[PDB]
Amino acid sequence: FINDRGIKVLWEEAYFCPCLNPDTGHPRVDCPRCHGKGIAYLPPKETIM
Amino acid sequence: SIEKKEEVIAHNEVVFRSLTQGLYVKEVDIYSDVVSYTKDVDEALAMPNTINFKNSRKYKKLIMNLDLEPLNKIQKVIYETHLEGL
Amino acid sequence: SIEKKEEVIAHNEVVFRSLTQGLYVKEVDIYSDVVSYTKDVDEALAMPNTINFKNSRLIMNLDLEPLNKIQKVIYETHLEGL
Amino acid sequence: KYENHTVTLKILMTLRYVVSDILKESRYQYTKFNQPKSKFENLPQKLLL
Amino acid sequence: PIQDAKPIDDIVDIMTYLKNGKVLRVKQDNQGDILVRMSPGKHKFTEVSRDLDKESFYYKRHWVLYNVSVNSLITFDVYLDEEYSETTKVKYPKDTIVEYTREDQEKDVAMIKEILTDNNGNYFYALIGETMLFDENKLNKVKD
Amino acid sequence: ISLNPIQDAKPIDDIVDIMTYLKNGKVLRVKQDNQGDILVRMSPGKHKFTEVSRDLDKESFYYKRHWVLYNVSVNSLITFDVYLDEEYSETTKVKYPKDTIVEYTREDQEKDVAMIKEILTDNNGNYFYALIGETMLFDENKLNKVKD
Amino acid sequence: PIQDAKPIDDIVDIMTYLKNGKVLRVKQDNQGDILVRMSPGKHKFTEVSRDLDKESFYYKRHWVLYNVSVNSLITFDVYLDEEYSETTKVKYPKDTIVEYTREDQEKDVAMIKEILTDNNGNYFYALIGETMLFDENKLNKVKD
Ligand SMILES: [Zn+2]
Numbered sequence: 240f241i242n243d244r245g246i247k248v249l250w251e252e253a254y255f256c257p258c259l260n261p262d263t264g265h266p267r268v269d270c271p272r273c274h275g276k277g278i279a280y281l282p283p284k285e286t287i288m
Numbered sequence: 289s290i291e292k293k294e295e296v297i298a299h300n301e302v303v304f305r306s307l308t309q310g311l312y313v314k315e316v317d318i319y320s321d322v323v324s325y326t327k328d329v330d331e332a333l334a335m336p337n338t339i340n341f342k343n344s345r346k347y348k349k350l351i352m353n354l355d356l357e358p359l360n361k362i363q364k365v366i367y368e369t370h371l372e373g374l
Numbered sequence: 375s376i377e378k379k380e381e382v383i384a385h386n387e388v389v390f391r392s393l394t395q396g397l398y399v400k401e402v403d404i405y406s407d408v409v410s411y412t413k414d415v416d417e418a419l420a421m422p423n424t425i426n427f428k429n430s431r432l433i434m435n436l437d438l439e440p441l442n443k444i445q446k447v448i449y450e451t452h453l454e455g456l
Numbered sequence: 457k458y459e460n461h462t463v464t465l466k467i468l469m470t471l472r473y474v475v476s477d478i479l480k481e482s483r484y485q486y487t488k489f490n491q492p493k494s495k496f497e498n499l500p501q502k503l504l505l
Numbered sequence: 506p507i508q509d510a511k512p513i514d515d516i517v518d519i520m521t522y523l524k525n526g527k528v529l530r531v532k533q534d535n536q537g538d539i540l541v542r543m544s545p546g547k548h549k550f551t552e553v554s555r556d557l558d559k560e561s562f563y564y565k566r567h568w569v570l571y572n573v574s575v576n577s578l579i580t581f582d583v584y585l586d587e588e589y590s591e592t593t594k595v596k597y598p599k600d601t602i603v604e605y606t607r608e609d610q611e612k613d614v615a616m617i618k619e620i621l622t623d624n625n626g627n628y629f630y631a632l633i634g635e636t637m638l639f640d641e642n643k644l645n646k647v648k649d
Numbered sequence: 650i651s652l653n654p655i656q657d658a659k660p661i662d663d664i665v666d667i668m669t670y671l672k673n674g675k676v677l678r679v680k681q682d683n684q685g686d687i688l689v690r691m692s693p694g695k696h697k698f699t700e701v702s703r704d705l706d707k708e709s710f711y712y713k714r715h716w717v718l719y720n721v722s723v724n725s726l727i728t729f730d731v732y733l734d735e736e737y738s739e740t741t742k743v744k745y746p747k748d749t750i751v752e753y754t755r756e757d758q759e760k761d762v763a764m765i766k767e768i769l770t771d772n773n774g775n776y777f778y779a780l781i782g783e784t785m786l787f788d789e790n791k792l793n794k795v796k797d
Numbered sequence: 798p799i800q801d802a803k804p805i806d807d808i809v810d811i812m813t814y815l816k817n818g819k820v821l822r823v824k825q826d827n828q829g830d831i832l833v834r835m836s837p838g839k840h841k842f843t844e845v846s847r848d849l850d851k852e853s854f855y856y857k858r859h860w861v862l863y864n865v866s867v868n869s870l871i872t873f874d875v876y877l878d879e880e881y882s883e884t885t886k887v888k889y890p891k892d893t894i895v896e897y898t899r900e901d902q903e904k905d906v907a908m909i910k911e912i913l914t915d916n917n918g919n920y921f922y923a924l925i926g927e928t929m930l931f932d933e934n935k936l937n938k939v940k941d
Pocket residue numbers: 256257258259266267270271272273274279
């Protein structure tokens with residue numbers, strides 16, 4: 240039923256990037272893992288939703 | 289020996305001259321017909337003609353007038369660098 | 375045509391260029407010997423081209439081509455007929 | 457004749473709307489029945505004007 | 506005589522001129538005149554502009570896409586823009602309905618198709634379904 | 650022992666010829682990417698306008714094609730490949746049409762690339778392909794089409 | 798000649814190299830090149846890295862898990878990363894479609910498979926389904 244009604248979508252989990260500055264507790268402006276956002280992401284997974 | 293040349297436009301407006309009188313317009317009435325004339329480019333009536341102001345409406349009845357000769361006035365500054373050896 | 379024109383000379387100065395690299399002088403040491411070079415013609419280290427300055431110190435370095443530099447800025451207006 | 461007068465009118469004008477927000481934007485369906493292959497189609501949006 | 510109008514008859518010619526890229530001018534009934542064009546570059550598509558006046562240092566034509574229909578082209582009058590004359594200064598234009606008295610002093614309605622003039626500006630009209638000329642005074646405009 | 654060559658339907662590329670056929674009144678057939686495959690005709694008689702129909706078949710005595718007015722667009726003709734009805738037909742829906750470039754297996758166990766230049770079918774319906782650089786004809790199962 | 802490419806044919810060898818732990822380099826179509834690896838330690842699982850450049854004091858490769866499919870490995874080109882040369886400077890790479898004239902001055906399409914060069918940099922190409930060499934000028938790139 241879920242596969243029948245859903246739409247194909249890519250799913251990637253989230254995790255805090257190591258680039259977070261230990262003292263201010265806030266991230267670097269530009270690094271490959273996260274492009275300014277304070278959160279990184281894992282490799283995509285395919286799913287229907 | 290000219291080394292670098294740059295050209296810059298300060299102003300770009302339209303000035304109207306009367307073919308017969310040879311004067312420039314300075315003022316117009318409610319109907320946009322001429323109220324006054326002046327023989328001075330610096331004091332003449334002007335329509336802005338930078339890129340954003342093209343295709344205006346305020347002076348349609350003026351432009352169509354055959355006695356008037358529109359003129360495109362442009363003011364420029366150019367910078368020329370030189371080298372003259374030792 | 376031209377309705378009004380005037381030419382004014384903003385600056386007259388002497389600029390230093392290396393004879394080997396061809397790079398102009400950007401920064402110098404305590405005795406005006408070069409420490410940095412730059413390719414820029416205009417950012418190059420420059421000094422007024424006046425006789426008094428010469429007597430007040432070209433003098434210092436050998437890989438040195440002391441060049442003169444002049445700037446012309448021109449104000450002009452046109453009435454382009456139809 | 458009406459140089460110095462107050463004129464009052466009743467008028468009819470054509471109806472006009474602009475989009476302020478989009479509500480229930482995208483609705484989807486993988487239509488497959490009686491098709492050579494699966495197809496994606498966008499169902500009606502709802503607009504708040 | 507005056508040659509202010511040079512209407513195109515065949516749409517094939519219109520398309521040929523469009524392939525050449527020359528701008529067109531298409532008339533409308535109780536509506537603004539329009540210009541039409543073929544886009545340059547890789548993708549070829551029809552463009553339109555509501556700007557009629559000539560390109561100038563103070564006036565630049567604005568072009569946009571549109572899904573023009575051949576039905577308008579095949580029906581409405583079409584001209585080369587640069588060759589078009591804005592107006593022909595006569596009392597009754599062509600295709601204008603007038604009432605005239607025939608040769609036997611009997612009155613009939615007609616529409617006008619002619620452009621003739623002397624060198625002073627005196628104009629004459631020849632009516633559809635008629636041969637001889639009719640003056641500005643003889644003809645009478647037929648009210649809608 | 651085979652049927653004569655069968656021709657592919659040539660898409661008309663230039664607008665001028667398409668209008669010329671349309672002015673003469675010869676029927677066109679347009680494929681729309683989104684909606685459908687349609688016929689286009691300019692109306693008979695003096696009342697001239699463009700007409701569209703979806704009755705995609707030869708005008709049989711028992712199959713009357715029906716027309717309705719539509720404001721066909723120039724851009725529609727340009728972007729969408731168009732055919733003449735007299736050619737586009739079920740008579741040939743060949744998998745690899747003429748001028749198609751394919752990869753074919755050679756006798757030396759090497760896969761070379763060649764273009765189809767002639768097409769004919771045997772009485773059993775198998776399509777024989779003539780390829781550039783080759784003399785004999787080739788079979789559909791032997792071939793491979795490389796896309797992109 | 799030049800040996801810039803040493804493609805692996807058998808996946809069994811690829812797995813064997815993976816068991817040895819050497820990094821791989823897998824090509825993609827209209828997409829970024831990727832590196833693949835087997836994880837060390839107790840648990841053995843495939844890892845990937847989007848970092849192509851060599852490990853350095855200023856550059857460290859980033860590895861993460863992934864459920865790689867054998868279908869990509871068996872189909873796509875694979876190389877040992879350290880042995881790979883970034884490019885071979887020729888006009889038409891291998892497996893590039895070109896149009897050439899055959900010996901009887903008849904024109905045919907072909908794809909390229911050869912790498913030969915003198916010591917000056919002059920390159921020659923041998924076409925699939927062909928034997929003799931073809932120059933950079935003789936071949937013509939076939940547009941998509
Ligand atoms: Zn980060």
